[PDB]
Structure formats: C-alpha cells, structure tokens
Amino acid sequence: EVVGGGDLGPNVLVFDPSTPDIQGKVDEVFRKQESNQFGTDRYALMFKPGTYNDINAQIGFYTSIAGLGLNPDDTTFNGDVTVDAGWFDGNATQNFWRSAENLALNPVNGTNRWAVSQAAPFRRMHVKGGLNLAPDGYGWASGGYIADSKIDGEVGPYSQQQWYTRDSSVGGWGNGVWNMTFSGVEGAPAQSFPEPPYTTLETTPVSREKPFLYLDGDDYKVFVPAKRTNARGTSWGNGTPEGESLPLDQFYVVKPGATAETINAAVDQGLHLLFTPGVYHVDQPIEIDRANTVALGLGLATIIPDNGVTALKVGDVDGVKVAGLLVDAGPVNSETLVEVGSDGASGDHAANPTSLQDVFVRIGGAGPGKATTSIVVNSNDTIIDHTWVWRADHGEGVGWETNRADYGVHVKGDNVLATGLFVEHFNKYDVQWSGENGKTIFYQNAKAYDAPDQAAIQNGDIKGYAAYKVDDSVTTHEGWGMGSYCYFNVNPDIRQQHGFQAPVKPGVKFHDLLVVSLGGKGQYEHVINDIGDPTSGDTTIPSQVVSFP
Ligand SMILES: OC[C@H]1O[C@@H](O[C@@H]2[C@@H](O)[C@H](O[C@@H]3[C@@H](O)[C@H](O)O[C@H](CO)[C@H]3O)O[C@H](CO)[C@H]2O)[C@H](O)[C@@H](O)[C@@H]1O
Ligand SMILES: OC[C@H]1O[C@@H](O[C@@H]2[C@@H](O)[C@H](O[C@@H]3[C@@H](O)[C@H](O)O[C@H](CO)[C@H]3O)O[C@H](CO)[C@H]2O)[C@H](O)[C@@H](O)[C@@H]1O
DSSP: OOOOOOOOOTTEEEEOTTOTTHHHHHHHHHHHHTTOTTOSOOEEEEEOSEEEEEEEEEOOTTEEEEEOSSSGGGEEEEEEEEBOOGGGTTOOTTOOSEEEESOEEEOTTSEEEBOOOSSOOEESOEESSEEEOSOTTOOOBOOOEEESOEEEEEEEOTTBSEEEEEEEEEEEEOOOSSEEEEEEEETOOOOOTTSSOEEEESSEEEEEOOOEEEEETTEEEEEEEOEEEEEOSOSSTTSSOSEEEEEGGGEEEEOTTOOHHHHHHHHHTTOEEEEOSSEEEESSOEEEOSTTOEEEESTTOEEEEOTTOOSEEEOSOSOOEEEEEEEEOOSSOEEEEEEESOTTOOOOOSSSOOEEEEEEEEESBBSOOOEEEEEEEOSTTOEEEEEEEEEOSSSBSOSTTTTOOOEEEEEOSSSOEEEEEEEEOOSSOSEEEOSSSEEEEEEEEEOOSOOOSGGGGEETTEESOOSEEEOTTOOOEEEEEEEEEEOOOSOTTOEEOOSEEOOOOTTEEEEEEEEEESTTSSEESOSBTTBSOOOOSSSOOOEEEEEEO
16 A cells, blocks of 8 residues: 655755755755754755765754765765854754764865754764864853764864764864763774763674665665674775665655554555654554664654654564654653563564664653653663653743653663663653663763752652662663763752662673762762762862772
C-alpha cells in the first residue's frame, strides 16, 4: 500500500553550484529563523556535490545544513557555516536545535564560528582552518558536540563551559573551562583534569556514524555507516567509508499530514522512514519493530505525541537507527516519550545494536508539555550518541507543575553506551541507570531552576534528586567527564545534596566529576554521594572529584 521515495517537499531546499542567488535564499531562511526559538517552521538546506563560493550560511533555529556527497570534501564551501549570538545580545546559551553535516569549509577569515549550545551537532565536517566555538564577544555558551570531523587548525572553545568531541582529528585545542571531554580524537590534549579540565580517552569503545542523505550520481540514497569498535579519528579520512547505501525508494518519505497508522504500516511493509522537515502530531506511538530500520529526520523534524501516548517505540530488534528527531511533549502527560525495547527485554544486540543519534526531547517551552519519563532504554547494547533531553526552563507553558517532568532518561538495559549525554531540569532524577555495565562518556546536566522550596525536592533522607543516579543494586558502571550545575533562582536557599549518586563498589567507577553553583543560586553539599567539597561563594567555582570510589 505504502509507496517509497518521491519528492522531499517544500521545506527541503536543494542547491547546486549553478543555483542562482544561494546567499539570498539562505539569508531569507535565516532572517525568519534567527530568533524563532519556539516556532513550528522547519528547514533543511542541502547542497549537491561541488564547490560553492561567496557563501556565509548563517544557521538559525530548526535549520539543518548538509552536503550530499559520499565524502565531506565532495561538497566544499569557500565561505562559512556560521552560528553567532547577535539575536540574544552575545549570549549563546539559547542557540539550540540546528545542525551541520558532511561539508568541507574554507572559512573567509581562516576560522569558522559555530557558537552553539545544546542540540546543535557538528558531524562529518572538514574545516580547512580553525573553529571558534564562542560567540563574538566571548559571552556565555553551553555546547556542544563534534563527531567524525577534521579541523585542520585549532578548535577554540574560549567561553564554552563544556564540550564533547569524538572520533575526530584536530590541529590543536585552545582551552578548557569546566569539562572538555575527548574520545578517539587525534590531536586531543592529554588527560589533565582538573587543570585544565581535560578528560581524554584514546578510543571510543563503540561508535557508529549517523546515517545521512546523499547523492549517488543523480539518485538520492541514505548512507549507513558500519560500526567501529575502539574508534579513533575520522571514518572517512582514508577513503571509501565502510557501510551500506539504501536507495530513497526504500524509504517512506514522511510529510505533513501523515498518520502514525500510515507510518507504522510503512515499517511493517519493509520501508525505512525519512522525516522531511515539519511538525508531526501522532495519536498513537510510532512503532519500529523491524530489524535495521533507519528513521532519519531532516531539518529538526519534530514529533508531538497527542493524548498522552508514547511518541516512539522501538521493538526488541537489532540495528534500528533513529537519527535527527525532536520529540516534543504534548500538554497531556505521556507516561513515556521514547521507549527503546520492551520492559524486561532480555536479549543481546552486541554485533548490531540499536542507536539513538541527535535525538532531542523537549518538555514545555512552546506551550505546556508533560511527561513522566522521557526516554526509557530497555534494549541491551543500545548506543545513545548525542541526546539532549530537556525540561524547558524558559518559554511558554513552563512551571514547577505546568511542565512537570519527573525523570529524564532511565537506562534499564545492559551494556548500554552513552556518548555525549545532555539532560536538564527534571523534577526528580535527570538520569537513572539500573542496567549493568553501562558507560557514559561526557555528561552535562543542570538541575531544575524552579523548585519552590527544599521540601519540593526531598528524596527520602536526601536533599534533592541526583542528576545521575546508579542504582544501589548495580555491580558494574563507568562514567567519564561529567558535570551537574544548579541555578535555584526561584529559591536560592535550596541545597542539592549531590550531582551524582552510586553504590560504593569496585566495579562502579567515575572519572572527572564536577558540580557547579551558577552565581550562588543554591549550592551543592557534595559532588557524589557524601564525597567531594560543597560548592561555596557566588563565584561559580566548580567542586571536583577526580576518581570515585
Ligand atoms: O563575514 C564572515 C564572518 O561572518 C560572521 O557572521 C557575522 C555575525 O557574526 C554577525 O553577528 C553580529 C553579532 O556578532 C552581534 O553580537 O550582534 C549583531 C546584531 O544582531 C550581529 O549582526 O552578523 C553578521 C551579519 O549581520 C554576520 O555576517 C562570522 O561570525 C565570522 O566567523 C565570519 O568570519
Ligand atoms: O536559561 C537558558 C539556558 O541556560 C543554560 O544554563 C545557563 C548557564 O549556561 C549560565 O552559565 C553562566 C556561565 O556560562 C558563565 O561562564 O558563568 C556565569 C556565572 O558568572 C554562569 O551563570 O547560567 C545561566 C543562569 O544564569 C543558566 O541558565 C541551560 O543549560 C539551558 O538548559 C537553558 O535553556
């Protein structure tokens, strides 16, 4: 019944080197999207292989930009892919929900500026120059994520609080502020936490590059990279990348108007899913219960579950690849927003795991939204490679009860790996880990700002809920480069007992932990459990623990 392939729709703007007035067209999109933080418009900018001149592609909200070559250098800009913070007067901490992928950049002054905060991935890029991650003026910034990229020159974070880079090559790295973490990065600074705060791993235990749309001659296909174990450096640096190409006609091209019934029928009939840029309400969960199904979003394609349903349920199958989607809570509380595997799921998926990549979750902000637990990861061996799970702290429909969301991520599966984990503002535990042999490389949290009083976050005999909790029953766990920040601005007398909570066991280990009070608005009593100094003063100095236990 469901037909594969077809037109990508009016929200995918496709350019070729002969297209007239590319700069004008990209500027038109930017003018509309620059300060459109919570609007429903969505755009994907796609560039056919070739060389583009005189281009400064400024990237606003809900805008993806990418090349369509098999390799990044197939699509080269003499010019820039720019994010700056002019619209927010130099403050980059709301520069969300945008992306760059699969381009080579020759920046006009020798340095490309990508001054982003959360949910702004930078993947499979070749920067023939330096990369500045800070807004002009060096104002506030809270990114960030680079994967599978080569920066010929220096990456300069400047004011960036923290950053995660994996499986990349850099010519240099300028500085660290609170938490700069690296895994598999050629050219990374050596391990040196706490000063500078560099957490450096020689390899990434497992990684699998995100699938992406490209052109094979004149035919659209999706490239599906093969997994790497103990990954280091780029996947494409040595020519022909390992992987499979799926023709576009094997994808159901989802466009505004599609129902979950039709989307589900497509997967049952053997089609993959390509979500064109838009906002999709569903009255029942999208169910992906076929092995190796790709569900790929363009232009920050967004799913809103109506009637309190779960937005996305992946079955107990190998190799599902969910990529580039925003799940946006409806005002009716959803018990869960995303489920990976069934409750009690018991099989292994080690050779061909399921992954979530550039999957973002929002609760509130564009109107009231509620969910009890945002992502539940049941399936063993699942890879979570860049997520931002965010209870809104600002916008419309925000409040301690108005956009209540108790739990961010709950990992129940075994051998689950999170690389680039960003989870913020939940009323209770932002992350809870119940499964065995979990690993997290890079964590960024901020606690809820709007707790009205101490009683509101009382957790048995503990003040507050950890940002990252490993259940007492767990035997093996390991985390690297992890920070939790507080800003109790509604009630700055509040105390948060710790950022992290875990059993004290030989196989449960942490490296380079920190907690930070932002401007003395509340304080931490400890870093992890009852260990580590409290934060003090109003000067935003981190409290650190190098090794636990
Ligand atoms: O010419 C290439 C050059 O482009 C720069 O992109 C700039 C923006 O940085 C600049 O942003 C301004 C902010 O810095 C300032 O804080 O506020 C004002 C007003 O909102 C902003 O305009 O805006 C211009 C367009 O007006 C862009 O061209 C890149 O940052 C830089 O890396 C690159 O070399
Ligand atoms: O509220 C918008 C956005 O805020 C993000 O967190 C910001 C912090 O990034 C910011 O941190 C400042 C540091 O960047 C700077 O170096 O030091 C100052 C103190 O001198 C810090 O305040 O602080 C503000 C509060 O003032 C926070 O809101 C969140 O990560 C994000 O979720 C949120 O949407």
